[PDB]
Design a protein around this nucleic acid. Structure first.
Lengths: 175, 82, 37
RNA sequence: UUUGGCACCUCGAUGUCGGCUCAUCGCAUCCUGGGGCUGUAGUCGGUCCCAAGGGUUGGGCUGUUCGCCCAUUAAAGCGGUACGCGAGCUGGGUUCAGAACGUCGUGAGACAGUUCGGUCCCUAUCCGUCGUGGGCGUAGGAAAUUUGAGAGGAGCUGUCC
RNA sequence: UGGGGCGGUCGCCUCCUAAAAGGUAACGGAGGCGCUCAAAGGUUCCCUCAGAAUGGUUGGAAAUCAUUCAUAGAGUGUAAA
RNA sequence: UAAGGUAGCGAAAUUCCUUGUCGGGUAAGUUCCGACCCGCACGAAAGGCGUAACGAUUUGGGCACUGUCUCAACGAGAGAC
RNA sequence: GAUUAUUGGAGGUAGAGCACUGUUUGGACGAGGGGCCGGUUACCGAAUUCAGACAAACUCCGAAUGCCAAUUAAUUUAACUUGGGAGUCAGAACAUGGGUGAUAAGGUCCGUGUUCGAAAGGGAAACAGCCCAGACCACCAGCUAAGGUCCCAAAAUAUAUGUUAAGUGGAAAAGGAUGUGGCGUUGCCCAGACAACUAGGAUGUUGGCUUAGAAGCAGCCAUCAUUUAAAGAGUGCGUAAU
């Protein structure tokens, strides 16, 4: 519950406008609205901003940090790209690429197929450098942190969906 | 019910009503009792007989005075002022 | 190492944080802070 | 949900262990189901959690409570309900009077140590449950078709490709 | 008689339960009794502690004896007071 | 002590240890048969052992047979209504 | 006769307390026995002190309160004797004290109070013993008690204050959070507390025992200075050395 060293939340050329309780990421790359909060009154003087902390209640000061870090995620991702690099391995059962999709010869009854995503760039450099470029942590950081769990690296062989900063471990392989 | 066994220790004495029977300032008779004791807790003084069982009586009629006897003991002093 | 009643880590860079509200600890000591009277 | 202790209700009677037929509620789950987790690569074994929705053989051998076995099964659960239910069934058993043995008792007789045999009443008045109709009413009357407030029932599996 | 039950016990005295007067229960706790002293009694005139160490023929330290303190710890016919 | 059970039958209408022991039989035998005796409490005229025949006698096993049963269905009837 | 102010006395409770009796000596203490030849030293019997702790059947001490009686005082209204006629002997629950049982029991036995029995009414949802409280009869009058005041249901959505977030309220024990405040400290402490963002966080040299070789875990450390804003013969999670 220790998060408050950074509470700045400065905007960029992307414009943090309002739509009521809603708040709109606009500008060079934007047009994505989302409600910051109710009490957390946000304000931008010319190009700097920071979440007002009214009364610093438990709820209010947690909402300060929500809106701060989430608008930071916005001005990070909708402006630059919430870009997360990862790799892939699927071995023996014919886990094969299909460009913007995939197939596995898991070789069940029926080998079973896989697909790509929407509004997020799945930029493949060499079929194992996949950049996932989106807009924020809550949902697309959830994408980056769930693609690893989609088919994660099973330890005793090591096939699955890895980050650039991930590894494979092993198991006491005793039936 | 079932086997409950031999059983002994319920033995005690049909008691006796000891101690005093009259009190300070009170006036008495000739064969009147003033105390039922054993041994000497108190010591007959003035006009006091002592029967066999350490029972005390006042030799006269009159009124009582308990008091110290020694430095740490106690007695009686009957007076028949009237 | 060999398992315990629990796991046996102890470290205390104790990120007792809610994930959007679900309280937990992203830490290594689940052995001490419980409810208490 | 053990063995007990207290002696309140019931001795002008609340009258029977079991089993049969029916059930019916729980979960502290046996199967299935899911997840996680291990001295789990999956399985494994095991573990923790979610889980009660349902389902949970047939014979042999003891009145015996009981357990043991033979074959299956996904399993072959634990409990609760006057030790679920006898004004629904049997009574095997125990308790009746006979008789036998062993032991004890001078003996009458007792034990329990066993064994054989030995009588289970009721025309349902009320509530209640299964159904069946009658009555009346639904601001006009009759025929037919209807919405459904809700209520009930339904959901087990395993196998080959 | 915490069902009858087998066991036990059933009459007196001391204590504790008993609650600072006395008094009082329990198949409640502990103990004595079913006598004895013609001297352990009566009455005059004396004595006064065991015990302890002190310690020494003794010595199983100690007996008997002896120095000094000992609370009646002595002891007092019969339990406890 | 007056003396100590002889034959014998034995885990038996009687074994506490105890389904003592161990087969046979059943796929499975808490029994049944058989056998071992470790006979609590075995023994011979309120008799011991074995016997053909006998038995609305007890108990185990088998064959037939079959709605006893799985697994219940139909009919006829008396009741019922 | 009673109640109480005034008495005066008896007495050994509770509590205290070891002073006896003694319950478990921590320590020493010196010896005896003893290991040894009659000795050594251990420890004890025991006692020496110091030293504490304990007590239904221990007491040097010792209450409150109750018992008895006084020109006892005052305010009440009893009190006693005689004799006629009776019923009661299974009591129950609460508080309380005690025993017994299992610091079990809505148990069981005594005791001190109270209620029922023999007593309605109100309150406790209903609720013989709990709380308030006794009815002679009326009465469409009033005042209050226990308890209560948003609806069923009469009364304040009253004031003013607070705490708490659980429907607690309106489920218990141990264990274990700060989950929160508070109350005071704490060591801080504006330089700047205390987790955290993070700065750099490395060696002659594991040196000695180097244990499976092991150079932060299945292990003992002689544990020498810093490279140096802040830092270690390496704070922190590996049981394969790293």
């Amino acid at each position: 519950s220790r998060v408050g060293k950074k509470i700045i939340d400065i905007p960029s050329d992307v414009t943090v406008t309002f739509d009521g309780n809603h708040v709109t990421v606009k500008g060079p790359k934007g047009e994505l609205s989302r409600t910051l909060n109710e009490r957390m009154t946000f304000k931008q003087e010319e190009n700097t901003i920071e979440v007002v902390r009214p009364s610093d209640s438990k709820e209010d000061r947690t909402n300060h940090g929500t809106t701060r870090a989430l608008l930071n995620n916005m001005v990070q991702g909708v402006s630059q790209g919430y870009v997360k690099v990862l790799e892939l391995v699927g071995v023996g059962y014919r886990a094969q690429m299909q460009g913007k999709d995939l197939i596995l010869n898991v070789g069940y009854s029926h080998p079973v197929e896989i697909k790509a995503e929407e509004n997020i760039t799945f930029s493949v450099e060499k079929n194992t450098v996949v950049k996932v470029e989106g807009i924020s942590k809550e949902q697309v950081g959830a994408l980056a942190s769930n693609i690893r769990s989609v088919r994660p690296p099973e330890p005793y062989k090591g096939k699955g969906i890895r980050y650039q900063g991930e590894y494979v471990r092993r198991k006491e392989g005793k039936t | 019910k079932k086997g409950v066994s031999s059983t002994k220790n319920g033995r005690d004495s049909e008691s006796k009503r000891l101690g005093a029977k009259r009190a300070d300032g009170q006036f008495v008779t000739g064969g009147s009792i003033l105390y039922r004791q054993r041994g000497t807790k108190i010591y007959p003084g003035e006009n006091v007989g002592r029967g066999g069982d350490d029972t005390l009586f006042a030799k006269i009629d009159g009124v009582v005075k308990f008091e110290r006897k020694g430095r740490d003991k106690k007695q009686v002093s009957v007076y028949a002022v009237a | 190492m060999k398992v315990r009643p629990s796991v046996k880590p102890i470290c205390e860079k104790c990120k007792v944080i809610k994930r959007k509200g679900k309280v937990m600890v992203i830490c290594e000591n689940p052995k001490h802070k419980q409810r208490q009277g």
